[PDB]
XYZ file of C-alpha atoms in Angstrom:
236
model
C -41.328 53.945 -1.824
C -41.061 56.775 0.850
C -37.674 57.426 2.333
C -37.537 60.079 5.158
C -34.520 60.704 7.125
C -35.193 62.236 10.783
C -31.921 64.294 11.968
C -31.201 66.566 15.036
C -31.944 70.093 14.627
C -29.171 72.914 15.400
C -29.337 76.132 17.623
C -32.563 77.567 16.163
C -34.373 74.277 16.345
C -34.906 74.328 12.431
C -31.532 73.820 10.583
C -29.249 70.705 10.783
C -27.123 70.413 14.104
C -24.224 68.850 14.615
C -24.033 65.137 14.217
C -21.593 63.043 12.159
C -24.094 60.310 12.258
C -26.764 62.722 10.594
C -24.368 63.744 7.821
C -23.181 60.197 7.295
C -26.718 58.718 6.446
C -27.546 61.999 4.429
C -24.621 61.259 2.488
C -25.287 57.873 1.895
C -28.965 58.636 0.711
C -27.418 61.493 -1.657
C -24.891 59.064 -3.106
C -27.578 56.530 -3.737
C -29.690 58.488 -6.180
C -32.652 57.797 -4.205
C -35.485 60.325 -3.725
C -35.773 61.133 -0.209
C -36.265 63.729 2.311
C -34.940 65.139 5.442
C -36.898 66.480 8.496
C -34.757 68.128 11.437
C -35.932 67.570 15.034
C -35.871 70.089 17.743
C -35.436 67.558 20.686
C -36.714 70.036 23.085
C -39.950 70.623 20.991
C -40.925 67.348 19.332
C -43.751 66.960 17.063
C -46.602 64.836 17.756
C -45.579 63.210 14.327
C -42.224 62.118 15.487
C -43.185 61.154 18.988
C -45.532 58.798 17.389
C -42.837 57.378 14.806
C -40.022 57.106 17.317
C -41.248 56.900 20.874
C -37.698 56.122 21.955
C -36.479 59.376 20.936
C -33.388 58.095 19.108
C -31.929 60.322 16.491
C -30.944 59.907 13.563
C -33.698 57.630 12.564
C -34.951 56.526 9.353
C -38.741 56.092 7.821
C -38.868 53.513 5.102
C -42.232 53.124 3.692
C -44.160 52.459 7.051
C -41.100 51.188 8.997
C -38.760 53.164 11.322
C -35.219 51.964 11.648
C -32.874 53.400 14.369
C -28.987 52.437 15.140
C -26.955 54.531 12.491
C -24.697 51.554 11.477
C -27.817 49.606 10.984
C -29.643 52.056 8.995
C -26.566 52.448 6.668
C -26.200 48.539 6.326
C -30.207 48.356 5.774
C -29.807 51.228 2.868
C -26.856 49.474 1.141
C -28.623 45.993 1.160
C -32.168 47.527 -0.117
C -31.082 50.235 -2.479
C -28.857 48.157 -4.872
C -27.798 47.640 -8.550
C -29.036 48.085 -11.255
C -31.405 50.747 -9.721
C -28.945 52.382 -7.332
C -25.284 52.025 -6.770
C -23.311 49.587 -4.476
C -21.533 52.149 -2.316
C -19.562 49.424 -0.012
C -15.781 49.812 -0.020
C -13.978 47.161 -2.152
C -10.816 47.000 0.185
C -11.749 46.138 3.841
C -9.016 48.206 5.208
C -10.635 51.370 3.719
C -13.565 50.655 6.183
C -10.926 50.868 9.097
C -8.424 53.598 8.176
C -8.744 56.683 10.326
C -11.449 55.243 12.647
C -9.557 56.258 15.861
C -8.998 59.881 14.906
C -12.367 60.974 16.565
C -11.849 59.535 19.910
C -8.222 60.995 19.858
C -9.840 64.393 19.105
C -12.286 64.115 21.772
C -9.574 63.557 24.324
C -7.744 66.564 22.827
C -10.564 68.827 22.898
C -12.332 67.807 26.285
C -8.886 68.066 28.189
C -8.604 70.894 30.671
C -5.415 69.825 32.145
C -2.420 71.938 30.319
C 0.077 69.282 31.343
C -1.692 66.772 28.729
C -2.290 69.102 26.066
C 0.851 68.378 24.214
C 0.614 64.686 24.344
C -3.069 64.575 23.329
C -2.284 66.750 20.315
C 0.684 64.452 19.462
C -1.843 61.611 19.898
C -4.186 63.302 17.390
C -1.224 64.117 14.849
C -0.172 60.550 14.800
C -3.662 58.950 14.248
C -3.907 61.539 11.069
C -0.677 60.449 10.085
C -1.676 56.763 10.141
C -4.710 57.944 7.873
C -2.274 59.647 5.556
C -0.391 56.463 5.328
C -3.366 54.626 4.077
C -4.255 57.426 1.684
C -0.648 57.248 0.046
C -0.455 53.615 -0.224
C -1.523 52.357 -3.522
C -4.656 50.184 -3.636
C -4.643 47.073 -5.743
C -6.546 48.803 -8.507
C -3.272 50.698 -8.887
C -0.992 47.819 -9.134
C 2.277 48.760 -11.091
C 1.351 52.349 -12.538
C 3.868 55.116 -11.400
C 4.951 58.548 -12.182
C 8.800 58.464 -11.909
C 8.988 61.484 -9.601
C 6.277 59.707 -7.404
C 6.930 56.077 -7.541
C 4.912 54.003 -5.146
C 2.469 56.755 -4.160
C -1.268 56.496 -4.797
C -3.090 59.195 -6.634
C -6.600 57.822 -5.716
C -9.209 60.708 -4.704
C -11.028 59.024 -1.822
C -10.465 56.153 0.990
C -11.189 53.090 -1.582
C -10.786 54.694 -5.131
C -11.787 57.435 -7.168
C -15.453 57.146 -5.923
C -17.108 57.991 -2.545
C -18.061 54.758 -0.396
C -19.626 54.216 2.665
C -16.135 54.304 4.442
C -16.035 58.037 3.241
C -19.646 58.640 4.579
C -18.650 57.603 8.025
C -15.130 59.147 8.195
C -15.743 62.691 6.514
C -18.307 63.884 9.073
C -15.988 63.148 11.672
C -12.857 64.881 10.059
C -15.052 67.864 9.442
C -15.968 68.393 13.180
C -12.281 67.751 13.931
C -11.134 70.573 11.625
C -13.695 72.985 12.556
C -13.465 72.557 16.471
C -9.475 72.447 16.437
C -9.397 75.622 14.295
C -11.583 77.681 16.529
C -10.679 76.440 20.022
C -6.961 75.141 19.852
C -5.266 77.054 17.162
C -4.622 73.666 15.535
C -4.913 72.684 11.844
C -4.064 69.378 10.062
C -0.711 69.656 8.945
C -0.789 70.373 5.186
C 2.313 67.823 5.187
C 0.010 65.128 5.610
C -0.376 65.550 1.637
C -2.521 62.255 1.624
C -5.026 63.520 4.037
C -4.956 66.931 2.480
C -5.974 65.934 -1.028
C -8.525 63.676 0.539
C -10.383 66.618 2.150
C -9.721 68.673 -0.821
C -11.495 66.401 -3.041
C -14.141 65.761 -0.409
C -14.945 69.606 -0.164
C -15.119 69.955 -4.054
C -17.976 67.249 -3.839
C -21.681 68.449 -3.233
C -22.407 65.257 -1.571
C -19.967 66.237 1.433
C -20.323 70.022 1.355
C -24.197 70.297 1.085
C -24.919 67.962 4.006
C -22.307 69.702 6.320
C -23.962 71.678 9.293
C -22.909 75.329 9.328
C -19.384 75.937 10.911
C -21.201 77.879 13.573
C -23.445 74.719 14.773
C -20.391 72.683 14.873
C -18.425 75.298 16.957
C -21.561 75.994 19.157
C -22.046 72.452 19.907
C -18.397 71.995 21.379
C -18.137 75.492 23.230
C -18.941 74.043 26.610
C -16.309 71.231 26.469
C -13.776 72.979 24.263
C -13.701 76.279 26.417
C -12.765 74.381 29.530
C -9.003 74.207 28.764
C -7.319 77.472 30.527
């Protein structure tokens, strides 16, 4: 049954553009094992096809069989619900709090990078650092799967790979595309990097990058950087 994801195109109108929602659903589908395809859309030059499939213009959108679904969160719920065991794995996190850790980082980055007031740059950076440290706290706290198993030099510290355990979940599909924008933009325009001393975050992204489901669905660094160049350059 034909699964077709429509995503926003980048600067050439062809390749995948900056959009954490595109990457998120791409990751969900890759993880599902399902046979699907991806069609980028140059929103300044829409095909007759797309115009007819999605007259409202929303992207991302999913074509599933004959039906079009919009609204990223809803496409994701739909996908989890319909592509299920035994045929396909459940991707939903086990621990509800994995679904919330790190959710505020994007909006804190947004304030940080759109700011043009030099007086507020240090505060905004701190706010960003803080939200990252809260995510780091979640990633270093043992999950229930890990109950009472310890290395003596590392007692009470989690060794899991991802948000919710050692497998990528929906929680990761949502968060990782966002964390990737944050890293890419802040490096380029703010001289800012995630402190390596957030060793929970650091291990997270290291393990994320080693996984083709993440790496391969990343827009090019340049696309992310071009997307942000108008708002990020404002700060003098």
